[PDB]
Amino acid sequence: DVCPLTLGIETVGGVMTKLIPRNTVVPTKKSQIFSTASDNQPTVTIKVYEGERPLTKDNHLLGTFDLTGIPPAPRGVPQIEVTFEIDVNGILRVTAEDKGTGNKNKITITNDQNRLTPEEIERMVNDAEKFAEEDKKLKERIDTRNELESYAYSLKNQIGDKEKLGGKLSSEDKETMEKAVEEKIEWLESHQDADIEDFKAKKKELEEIVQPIISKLYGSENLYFQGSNRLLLTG
C-alpha cells in the first residue's frame, strides 16, 4: 500500500515542505532537521498537511502540535528533527525533537480522523496537474527567497558570534556588514511577493559587500559564505 497524497509540514510563508512523497510504500520513516523562524523562539508549531500544492492553504490539514521549552538561541540554530512514521495500518506518527535537549513531542494521526473523500483526493491531483507549471515557478521562487533569507540570517548570526566570524572581523567591517544585512532583511520583510530576478538581485548586492571582506579575513579568494539552508518553523 502507498500514500495517496504527499505528506509534510508548513514552513515559514505558508510553505508546504515534503516529508513523505506521494505514492511512498508503507511502512516508512523519514525525517528532516528544521529550526526556529525567530530569534529567541521558545516554541515551534508543527502543522501536518496532505496535498501536492506548494502553499499549505491549498492543501489539507491533518493535525497540529507544539514543541516547547526551546533554549534561547539565534534564528536558524536550534536543531528540530521532525520525523514521519507510517506503519502498515496507515497510522501516522509525527515527532518533533530538540537534538540539543532531547525534548520530544508527538502526534498520532489515524486515516479516519480527517479523511478525504476519493473525489477530494482526485481533485487535489487534478489541480496539481492543471497548475503544474505555475506551481513549478512558485516553488523555484520560494526556494530562491528562503536561500537569500538563510544567507542573511546566517550572516547576522556569524557577525554576532565571537567564536567564529565576529571574532575574526573588525570595525568598520562589522558595522559595514551588519548595516548591510539589516538593510536586506528589512527589504525582505516587505517584499515576499518579489519575483525571481529581484531576489537574485538583492543577494548579488549583499555578496559584493560580504565577499571582499571574507576574501581577506581568510587567505583564499575561493572561500564563499553560504547559509545553512535550514527550513524554518513559526511557533
From Swiss-Prot:
Industrial and biotechnological uses noted in the record: Antibodies against the protein protects endothelial cells from invasion by the fungus R.delemar, a causative agent of mucormycosis, and could thus potentially be used to treat mucormycosis disease. Antibodies against the protein also protect a diabetic ketoacidosis mouse model against mucormycosis.
Subcellular location: Endoplasmic reticulum lumen; Melanosome; Cytoplasm; Cell surface
Modification after translation: AMPylated by FICD. In unstressed cells, AMPylation at Thr-101 by FICD inactivates the chaperome activity: AMPylated form is locked in a relatively inert state and only weakly stimulated by J domain-containing proteins. In response to endoplasmic reticulum stress, de-AMPylation by the same protein, FICD, restores the chaperone activity.
Modified positions (Phosphothreonine) in chain numbering: 101
Residues found modified as O-AMP-threonine: 101
Induction profile: By endoplasmic reticulum stress. Induced in nasal epithelial cells by high free iron levels. Induced in nasal epithelial cells in high glucose. Induced in nasal epithelial cells by 3-hydroxybutyric acid (BHB).
Effect of residue 168 to R: Complete loss of in vitro methylation by METTL21A
Modified residues (Omega-N-methylarginine): 75
Record PTM N6,N6-dimethyllysine, positions in chain: 168
Protein family membership: Belongs to the heat shock protein 70 family.
Disease as annotated in the protein's UniProt record: Autoantigen in rheumatoid arthritis.
Complexes and interactors: Monomer and homooligomer; homooligomerization via the interdomain linker inactivates the chaperone activity and acts as a storage of HSPA5/BiP molecules. Interacts with DNAJC1 (via J domain). Component of an EIF2 complex at least composed of CELF1/CUGBP1, CALR, CALR3, EIF2S1, EIF2S2, HSP90B1 and HSPA5. Part of a large chaperone multiprotein complex comprising DNAJB11, HSP90B1, HSPA5, HYOU, PDIA2, PDIA4, PDIA6, PPIB, SDF2L1, UGGT1 and very small amounts of ERP29, but not, or at very low levels, CALR nor CANX. Interacts with TMEM132A and TRIM21. (Microbial infection) Interacts with Japanese encephalitis virus envelope protein E.
Function of the protein: Endoplasmic reticulum chaperone that plays a key role in protein folding and quality control in the endoplasmic reticulum lumen. Involved in the correct folding of proteins and degradation of misfolded proteins via its interaction with DNAJC10/ERdj5, probably to facilitate the release of DNAJC10/ERdj5 from its substrate. Acts as a key repressor of the EIF2AK3/PERK and ERN1/IRE1-mediated unfolded protein response (UPR).
Record comment regarding domains: The interdomain linker regulates the chaperone activity by mediating the formation of homooligomers. Homooligomers are formed by engagement of the interdomain linker of one HSPA5/BiP molecule as a typical substrate of an adjacent HSPA5/BiP molecule. HSPA5/BiP oligomerization inactivates participating HSPA5/BiP protomers. HSPA5/BiP oligomers probably act as reservoirs to store HSPA5/BiP molecules when they are not needed by the cell. When the levels of unfolded proteins rise, cells can rapidly break up these oligomers to make active monomers.
Name of the molecule in the record: Endoplasmic reticulum chaperone BiP
Lineage, broadest ranks: Eukaryota, Metazoa, Chordata, Craniata, Vertebrata
Gene behind the chain: HSPA5
Full-sequence portion shown in this chain: 418 to 637 of 654
